[PDB]
Design a protein around this nucleic acid. Sequence first.
RNA 1: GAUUGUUCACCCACUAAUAGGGAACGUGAGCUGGGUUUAGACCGUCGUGAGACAGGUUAGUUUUACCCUACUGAUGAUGUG
RNA 2: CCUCACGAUCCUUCUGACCUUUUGGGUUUUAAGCAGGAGGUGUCAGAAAAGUUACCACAGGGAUAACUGGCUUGUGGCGGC
RNA 3: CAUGAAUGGAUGAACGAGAUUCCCACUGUCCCUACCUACUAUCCAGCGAAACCACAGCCAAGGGAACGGGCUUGGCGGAAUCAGCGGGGAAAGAAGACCCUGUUGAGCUUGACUCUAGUCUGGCACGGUGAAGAGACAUGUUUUUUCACUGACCCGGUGAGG
RNA 4: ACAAAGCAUCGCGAAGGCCCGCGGCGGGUGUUGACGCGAUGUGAUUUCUGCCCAGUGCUCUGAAUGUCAAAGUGAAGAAAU
RNA 5: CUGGAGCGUCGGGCCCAUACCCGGCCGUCGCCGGCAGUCGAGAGUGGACGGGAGCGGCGGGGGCGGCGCGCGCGCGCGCCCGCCCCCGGAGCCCCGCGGACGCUACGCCGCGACGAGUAGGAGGGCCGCUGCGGUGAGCCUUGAAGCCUAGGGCGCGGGCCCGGGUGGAGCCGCCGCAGGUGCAGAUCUUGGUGGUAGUAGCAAAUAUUCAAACGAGAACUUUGAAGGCCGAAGUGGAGAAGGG
RNA 6: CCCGGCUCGCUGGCGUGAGCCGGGCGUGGAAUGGAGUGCCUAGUGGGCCACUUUUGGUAAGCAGAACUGGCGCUGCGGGAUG
RNA 7: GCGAAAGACUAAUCGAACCAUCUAGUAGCUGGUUCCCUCCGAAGUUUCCCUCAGGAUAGCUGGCGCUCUCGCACACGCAGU
RNA 8: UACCCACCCGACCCGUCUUGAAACACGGACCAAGGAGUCUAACACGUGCGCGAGUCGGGGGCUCGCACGAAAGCCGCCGUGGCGCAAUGAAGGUGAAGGCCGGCGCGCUCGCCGGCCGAGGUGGGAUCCCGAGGCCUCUCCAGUCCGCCGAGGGCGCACCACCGGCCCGUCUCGCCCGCCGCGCCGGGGAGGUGGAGCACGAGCGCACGUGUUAGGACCCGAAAGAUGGUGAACUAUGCCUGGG
RNA 9: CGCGACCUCAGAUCAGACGUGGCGACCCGCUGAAUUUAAGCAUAUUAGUCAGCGGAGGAGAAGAAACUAACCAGGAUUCCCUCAGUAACGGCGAGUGAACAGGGAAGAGCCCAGCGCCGAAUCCCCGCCCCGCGGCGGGGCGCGGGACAUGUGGCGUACGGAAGACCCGCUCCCCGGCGCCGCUCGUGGGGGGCCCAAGUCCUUCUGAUCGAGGCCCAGCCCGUGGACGGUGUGAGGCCGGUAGCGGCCCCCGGCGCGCCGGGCCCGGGUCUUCCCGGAGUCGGGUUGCUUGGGAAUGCAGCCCAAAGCGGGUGGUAAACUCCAUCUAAGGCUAAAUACCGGCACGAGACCGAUAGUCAACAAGUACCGUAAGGGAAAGUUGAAAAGAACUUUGAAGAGAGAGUUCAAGAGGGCGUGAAACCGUUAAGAGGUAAACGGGUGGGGUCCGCGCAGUCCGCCCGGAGGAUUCAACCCGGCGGCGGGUCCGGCCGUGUCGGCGGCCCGGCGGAUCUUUCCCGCGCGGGGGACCGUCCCCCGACCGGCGACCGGCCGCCGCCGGGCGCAUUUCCA
Lengths: 147, 210
Amino acid sequence: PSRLRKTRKLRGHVSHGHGRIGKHRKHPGGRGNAGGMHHHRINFDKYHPGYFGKVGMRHYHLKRNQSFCPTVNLDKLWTLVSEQTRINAAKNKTGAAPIIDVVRSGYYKVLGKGKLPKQPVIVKAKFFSRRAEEKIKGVGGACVLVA
Amino acid sequence: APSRNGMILKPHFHKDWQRRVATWFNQPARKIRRRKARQAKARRIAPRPASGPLRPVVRCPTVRYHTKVRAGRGFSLEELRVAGIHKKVARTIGISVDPRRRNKCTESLQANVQRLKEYRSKLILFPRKPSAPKKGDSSAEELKLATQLTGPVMPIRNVYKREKARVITDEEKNFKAFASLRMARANARLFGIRAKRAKEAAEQDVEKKK
RNA sequence: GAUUGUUCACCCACUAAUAGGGAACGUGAGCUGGGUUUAGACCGUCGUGAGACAGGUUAGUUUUACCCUACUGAUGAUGUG
RNA sequence: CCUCACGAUCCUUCUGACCUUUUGGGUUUUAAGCAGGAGGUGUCAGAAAAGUUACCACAGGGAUAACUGGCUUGUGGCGGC
RNA sequence: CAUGAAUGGAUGAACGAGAUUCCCACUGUCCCUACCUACUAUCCAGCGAAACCACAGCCAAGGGAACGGGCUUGGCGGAAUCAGCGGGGAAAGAAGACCCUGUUGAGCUUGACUCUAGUCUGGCACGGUGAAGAGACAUGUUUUUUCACUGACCCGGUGAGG
RNA sequence: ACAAAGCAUCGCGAAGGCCCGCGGCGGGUGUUGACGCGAUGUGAUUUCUGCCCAGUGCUCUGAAUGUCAAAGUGAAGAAAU
RNA sequence: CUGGAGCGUCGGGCCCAUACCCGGCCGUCGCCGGCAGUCGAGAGUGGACGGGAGCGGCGGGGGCGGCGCGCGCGCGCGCCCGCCCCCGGAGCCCCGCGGACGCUACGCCGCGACGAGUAGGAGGGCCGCUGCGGUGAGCCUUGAAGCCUAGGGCGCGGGCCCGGGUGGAGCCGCCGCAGGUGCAGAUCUUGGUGGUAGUAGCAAAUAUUCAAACGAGAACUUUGAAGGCCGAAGUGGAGAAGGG
RNA sequence: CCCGGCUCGCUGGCGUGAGCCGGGCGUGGAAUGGAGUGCCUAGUGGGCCACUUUUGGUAAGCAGAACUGGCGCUGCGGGAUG
RNA sequence: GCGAAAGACUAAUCGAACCAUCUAGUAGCUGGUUCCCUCCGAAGUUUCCCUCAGGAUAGCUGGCGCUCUCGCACACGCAGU
RNA sequence: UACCCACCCGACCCGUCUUGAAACACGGACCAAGGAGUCUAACACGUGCGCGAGUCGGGGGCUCGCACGAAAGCCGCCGUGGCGCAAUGAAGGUGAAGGCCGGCGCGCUCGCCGGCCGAGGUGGGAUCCCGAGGCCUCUCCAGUCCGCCGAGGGCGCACCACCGGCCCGUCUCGCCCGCCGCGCCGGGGAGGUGGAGCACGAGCGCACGUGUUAGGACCCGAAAGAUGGUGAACUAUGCCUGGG
RNA sequence: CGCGACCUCAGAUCAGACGUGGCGACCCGCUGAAUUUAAGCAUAUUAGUCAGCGGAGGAGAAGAAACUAACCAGGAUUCCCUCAGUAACGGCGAGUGAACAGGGAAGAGCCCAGCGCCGAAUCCCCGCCCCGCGGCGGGGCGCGGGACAUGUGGCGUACGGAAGACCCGCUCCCCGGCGCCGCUCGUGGGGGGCCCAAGUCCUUCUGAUCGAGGCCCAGCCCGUGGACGGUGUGAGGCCGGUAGCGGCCCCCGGCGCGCCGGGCCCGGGUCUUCCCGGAGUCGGGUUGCUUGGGAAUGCAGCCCAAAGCGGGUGGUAAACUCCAUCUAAGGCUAAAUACCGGCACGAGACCGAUAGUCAACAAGUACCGUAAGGGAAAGUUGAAAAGAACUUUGAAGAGAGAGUUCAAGAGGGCGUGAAACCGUUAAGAGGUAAACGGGUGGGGUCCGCGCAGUCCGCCCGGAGGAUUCAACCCGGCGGCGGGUCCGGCCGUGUCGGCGGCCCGGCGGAUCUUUCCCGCGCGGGGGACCGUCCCCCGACCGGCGACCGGCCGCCGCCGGGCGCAUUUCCA
Ligand SMILES: [Mg+2]
Ligand SMILES: [Mg+2]
Ligand SMILES: [Mg+2]
Ligand SMILES: [Mg+2]
Ligand SMILES: [Mg+2]
Ligand SMILES: [Mg+2]
Ligand SMILES: [Mg+2]
Ligand SMILES: [Mg+2]
Ligand SMILES: [Mg+2]
Ligand SMILES: [Mg+2]
Ligand SMILES: [Mg+2]
Ligand SMILES: [Mg+2]
Ligand SMILES: [Mg+2]
Ligand SMILES: [Mg+2]
Ligand SMILES: [Mg+2]
Ligand SMILES: [Mg+2]
Ligand SMILES: [Mg+2]
Ligand SMILES: [Mg+2]
Ligand SMILES: [Mg+2]
Ligand SMILES: [Mg+2]
Ligand SMILES: [Mg+2]
Ligand SMILES: [Mg+2]
Ligand SMILES: [Mg+2]
Ligand SMILES: [Mg+2]
Ligand SMILES: [Mg+2]
Ligand SMILES: [Mg+2]
Ligand SMILES: [Mg+2]
Ligand SMILES: [Mg+2]
Ligand SMILES: [Mg+2]
Ligand SMILES: [Mg+2]
Ligand SMILES: [Mg+2]
Ligand SMILES: [Mg+2]
Ligand SMILES: [Mg+2]
Ligand SMILES: [Mg+2]
Ligand SMILES: [Mg+2]
Ligand SMILES: [Mg+2]
Ligand SMILES: [Mg+2]
Ligand SMILES: [Mg+2]
Ligand SMILES: [Mg+2]
Ligand SMILES: [Mg+2]
Ligand SMILES: [Mg+2]
Ligand SMILES: [Mg+2]
Ligand SMILES: [Mg+2]
Ligand SMILES: [Mg+2]
Ligand SMILES: [Mg+2]
Ligand SMILES: [Mg+2]
Ligand SMILES: [Mg+2]
Ligand SMILES: [Mg+2]
Ligand SMILES: [Mg+2]
Ligand SMILES: [Mg+2]
Ligand SMILES: [Mg+2]
Ligand SMILES: [Mg+2]
Ligand SMILES: [Mg+2]
Ligand SMILES: [Mg+2]
Ligand SMILES: [Mg+2]
Ligand SMILES: [Mg+2]
Ligand SMILES: [Mg+2]
Ligand SMILES: [Mg+2]
Ligand SMILES: [Mg+2]
Ligand SMILES: [Mg+2]
Ligand SMILES: [Mg+2]
Ligand SMILES: [Mg+2]
Ligand SMILES: [Mg+2]
Ligand SMILES: [Mg+2]
Ligand SMILES: [Mg+2]
């Protein structure tokens, strides 16, 4: 609201919070980000390092859907499944290893972060990490690829 | 004049925005103009699916939307001379007809033919006249309904099949999936050069003989 | 007094003497406008040129007081029944 | 022997990796990257740049001259030992 | 310093509301002012503005933003006004025309930077027909040089008359 | 100051000189033709008008072995080249 | 001003600042502050409960003393034995059984310290303006807003409340929300009004006067008379354009 | 600080050295005061004066530095005034 | 445009008309910037800048906090010494 | 206290730029009404609230002629999607775990197989836990209840300092590889170094404040530039026709 | 040198039509700046924007792929969310800056030329009649014309089509009229007209009330109506209105049956024979503008200038090479979409006469300028004009009386009537311009008082006078608290019932297709777990969640108590 604004408390104050030596003229610095090279260099160079200049390689008409690839960590794999299918395991005495279709929960890749519960699994994904391979293998379980 | 660690902020107001600002105070009144039309059209075509004709099952193009399924534009032609519905007739029995769909697979063909066989079965054709001939469903299943289908006719639900637990064999436990992926990504990489060495090594066997 | 826009200068003549200065380098709603110092022009030098020149030269609007004060005059004024 | 003898972005060129991209695959050119040097900004943290205005204009400046006034008194004048 | 030949040199009758100098005549320009007249101003009846104005309005000296009306210390001060007057209000009139700044301009200039209309030249197109002949390359092609023609095209005339 | 008579150069024989126009096979000079039109310089008369073509211009049936583009032709390549 | 009101070197005494001391009030900051029902002033424990017993005690430093002693342990009464009892009442300077008037717990209270201010920041504003959602069994033709008041007062102040008056139809308090929200100033804008001032002024072309008429009223109209000027390149007689 | 012991691809005739684990021991000059640390951030970026030091200048109410203090930002008593 | 030429004149306007719009053109530059009380309280210096009337960054300032300390007989830490 | 008057002391006119203003610096005759830090978007931090590895919000949809409504409510829409949940490389691309033990390859600080623990350690660390010993309690002793003090000892959040470790890029150096193919194939190691990284999370949405911008942008202010138009009734020339 | 066809081309006040101009918010072609930004500036930016110009419509444009894509692929256009301030552009700086996919609104598709087939199977205008006539048409009849063979009509157009053979199945729509039947959503479609509840009841204010109390339930009545406006204040009831699947009357719209006049022999699937696409276009060179599009996105001018397993696209030029995907050079099209103009409405946390549009009024008016253009000020008497008759003074303007009014201290620019400023009355002052701060004093206007202000309030003591109780019991009522948790109700934690579990459901990628229904999938049942509900028993928090008895206390009422009590007063 206008009610709680410092512009109320600046009534009867001549300069209105802008100082009477150097008044609030219109545009003293420049207009916008203007003068990155000249006379604003200390800012752009000490707060935005790497602003000015080209780098890398042009890829004209990029489309994100080509390179779309979400990721899961093994940290939260048994979250994609209802936790009861995990409780209907570590039990059942048969080596059930329920199937987890990482594709169905919207992830085209499984990465190897975090601990994994000592439990057999079948993980269907598109692209695996190497360590995510070894974490599932070493727990006892398979890595199954899907197209 | 920047001060002490902000962003760079290229905001697009240099041109002239104040003139061509489009405010949306129509928004709640447009909700109502459409609502009457939506209703006035359903009351105008009384026994008929209010949602509109039947659309086909269809898969989304790019690899990120691979696994979803949509309601397509219209049933294709190749689909239709399998279910035995003439292309000009289907336009008159609430079947969207798309004469522009290249069918590449039998999977999505039969899956999409099923909806046309299914449509026929639960379709009630009011006959041309009150006292009218064949293919118009009987008066018993004419009194039973005046029902417009509120919402899409037979809504396409993205549905999956469960895969039960397994006994993993000592063959799936040997697959080095990270390994073979790098292999396949290398074979697609270098297949083109490897064949040029075969084309050159096949010339050295003809150049050595001569 | 002669010359000079001149301050300054130089001379003639007189005289007792032709001392030196200040007052916003006294004094433009007191004057004059000759000189500087707009616009017009003219030469010389300089500049390829527009133009420049404490280098000359001729032509070029000089407003307002009835207000307060000061001053000059002019009536008066409280006191003295 | 020590304390000076030098140069960003962008651009250009040269050099390096059996490098990467060159886009629906594949092969060659070509181009684009990556990593180092060079081509230069002497106003040297790096605009691509001649004048004139006495026909002039605007924003300002007593932060910046040309009068007066102050301080100073070399110089000028006047005066001592 | 620094004249000078059509950026014209030298002359020169007549002419000039052109610039100077001298002499005669004349004169209140002056020595040195005087008086006279008309219209004013002046007073009155009638009618009646404006610029301007922080507050205002007597001085010396001191200090002070380095020349006060006000402040300090002195000097002093007597209602309400009339005709004058030009010492003072750094009086009014105009956000100085000079000067300097501005990354503010305009007018003009050129050996500034960047361009432009226009024009000179080549190519290509509309652009054809016929004729000779020649070189260059090659063992036909190309370059074509020159001289013709008249259907495009162009100009000229007439009331499209031989 | 300008103008001016006069003196003087300068271009041009008409698909021309100068010039206008956005454009036309458009217009001005031109109801014209070198004693005419256009472009300048000086400024009556009298008397004269001196040297300098190195500079910048202008110009010249002038050599263009200097350079020089589009196309054009020639060659290598698989083709951009 | 002159054996000083002068100049040196010195006395005492006195005079005064928003400085320092003591006191009063106002605010700010600090107090790991106190107070939502409690003992306790260098605090240096309190309470079961058992066995045994009693004038016992804890027979420890000129320390000058702090930790232990002389207002009681046990005691008076009931009569060596019992008790040594209950606040719905011990009568209360401590009360732990129930808690202020005080306790809007963003309330109230006790200590200290400290309080210059532009540019600027922050906080608080039962400071003010207009409008909305609430709410005030609000106010109002027995007089609302506004305005006016040498009327009585409150707040450090922004401002506010009352008294009278005129005025003739509406208006405010509190809890929240919203702003085109507070003026001395910008050679500010618009409107109004002064001082100047009854002042400058009503001075270019020589000129008016007498009588009468009309009239409420005559220097200025009208008529008569007289004097005058324009003087036919006119202040005379007719037109164009323009005016209408 | 003082002991005991492990580790090393460095260093070396052995030891160095550093790193670790494990134990053993308290006021280390005076005077003062509660300290540490992170976010946003306005105004400012014309300065001036005095003691002392000091550079130009002949000198300046001149130009230019040091050190502190002021004035600007700030009244009060005193210096008549400032 | 027109100029016997002064940058003259073009409806009180001319070194380049008047009218409306683009337009609230831009301004590192003048001017102004509206109620109280309470607490804290500066700078005119640093480096870079077509920088020198402006900015950028340093400082100096305030607000917001947090981490703890222990005057709750029982403190480490810092300092214009 | 406010009206008038009197006196003693004090006392220069405000606003402003300014090293310095009562200034012989500028704005200001007076009085009324008007009058200047706004809205939008985008960030940033602080703060409040909902939910929390999620959380929305829009557009749609389902419910009305609105009175209040162009509101409110509801929807596998609620996740299509944004932001977050993961980085790093120019890119092809890769992608956050280590410890320990035993066993097997020669433990070779190398490679492989079975089991255990799981985000490493050091120093501070608010700090809770355990607490030797005290401190009383009317007796000598016995003894369970209640706390106060509490030397010393333990776990140790948050955070800070450091050492380790892992991911990716690059380098160096070196070893063994796996084999749906052949290795100008792919894969692992040790040591250093680049990174906006991980090392059991903190975001999303909605408010409000402050600040910085883009916007006319706190209000007023140019000399100019551009696009279209209207003027020769003045004046500048030429022409036509009249007059002197 | 004649007459006749046709091709070119003229003239008609020939018969019949049609076009121009205006508006201009939205829309479509073209043209096209500069302020500005970059702290200068020329590229850039402002910006394909302002102005200029043309052209429309109720919407316009776009639109049925020479598309997207690289997928297990999508399928006209337009709009919204999103992509995303991202890929790219840029003195790579200032700044600029799309698309694809996904979700949704809406959803509709189609014609030619050609190649062919058909006896031109066609169309136009005349002349007579039949119907119809205020969107000029249908039906018939005519050697009445003419267009057309340089090409009209039917089938047909790439999704394939035609033609054939045989395979199968049996045939209403369209239009011109002529009527008639159901008035057809805001809950009777559009428009018009006329209509539909309840107090001027009592008292009282007042100039007049619509106010204040009151009136058979906040008073009377109505309430499917209590919005608003009018009315001499503030009104559901007085008036208009309001509500209401309320009524009635016209008109118009639109849809439904009948009659008639005409048109129309219109299918579906299989095997074979042919049949095919738009040229000065594509494409290339180049120059200029444009995009963000880059060794050239789009557009142009000029030059060159095609092909037919071809051509375009496949976002870095090029060759070779494979794949994908469309079919250009011709055309039509509703719906969501846009609207600062116009007609007609509705609303508001808007402004309230210096505000709000320039304009609340005779406002784009008065007025200025030659002209293009510029462009104001200015609302309010009272309720009703009841707007001052009459007498009087004056030449008259103006007064004095009178009168009207609730008020003229509302008098025609008249509500309220501020300040500056001025007038006069009262009071006080007055040689250092005024004004001012501190401190008092003097005078005033009023204000509080007092004709003692002695301020009160307990308790007590004393002396007077008066009514009834307290204390105590007894009857009743009503509370409080208490515990025996005593009896019952209630809920927390736990346990038991596996009892609700199917007579409890919902959720779950749990499980079974032994099942059931429908077409491996979908729906439904059955198994499972997590969660939520019933029976009873036990323990415990026995909880403000109660109910009943018992108790203790309190209070009120009513009795009893008559006076050493208990109250009142002075
Ligand atoms: Mg301040
Ligand atoms: Mg200011
Ligand atoms: Mg839909
Ligand atoms: Mg002088
Ligand atoms: Mg003078
Ligand atoms: Mg003068
Ligand atoms: Mg002169
Ligand atoms: Mg001159
Ligand atoms: Mg000469
Ligand atoms: Mg010369
Ligand atoms: Mg290709
Ligand atoms: Mg000159
Ligand atoms: Mg000149
Ligand atoms: Mg100065
Ligand atoms: Mg001087
Ligand atoms: Mg006079
Ligand atoms: Mg003067
Ligand atoms: Mg500058
Ligand atoms: Mg310029
Ligand atoms: Mg040049
Ligand atoms: Mg000449
Ligand atoms: Mg000569
Ligand atoms: Mg020469
Ligand atoms: Mg203070
Ligand atoms: Mg009001
Ligand atoms: Mg009224
Ligand atoms: Mg408002
Ligand atoms: Mg105001
Ligand atoms: Mg005469
Ligand atoms: Mg006449
Ligand atoms: Mg400054
Ligand atoms: Mg300044
Ligand atoms: Mg100064
Ligand atoms: Mg002065
Ligand atoms: Mg000034
Ligand atoms: Mg310009
Ligand atoms: Mg038209
Ligand atoms: Mg600029
Ligand atoms: Mg600028
Ligand atoms: Mg500029
Ligand atoms: Mg540009
Ligand atoms: Mg553009
Ligand atoms: Mg336009
Ligand atoms: Mg259309
Ligand atoms: Mg179209
Ligand atoms: Mg699309
Ligand atoms: Mg994003
Ligand atoms: Mg653009
Ligand atoms: Mg045909
Ligand atoms: Mg009624
Ligand atoms: Mg009413
Ligand atoms: Mg009413
Ligand atoms: Mg094309
Ligand atoms: Mg461009
Ligand atoms: Mg390519
Ligand atoms: Mg088409
Ligand atoms: Mg008005
Ligand atoms: Mg008003
Ligand atoms: Mg108005
Ligand atoms: Mg009025
Ligand atoms: Mg009024
Ligand atoms: Mg009245
Ligand atoms: Mg009135
Ligand atoms: Mg009045
Ligand atoms: Mg008097």
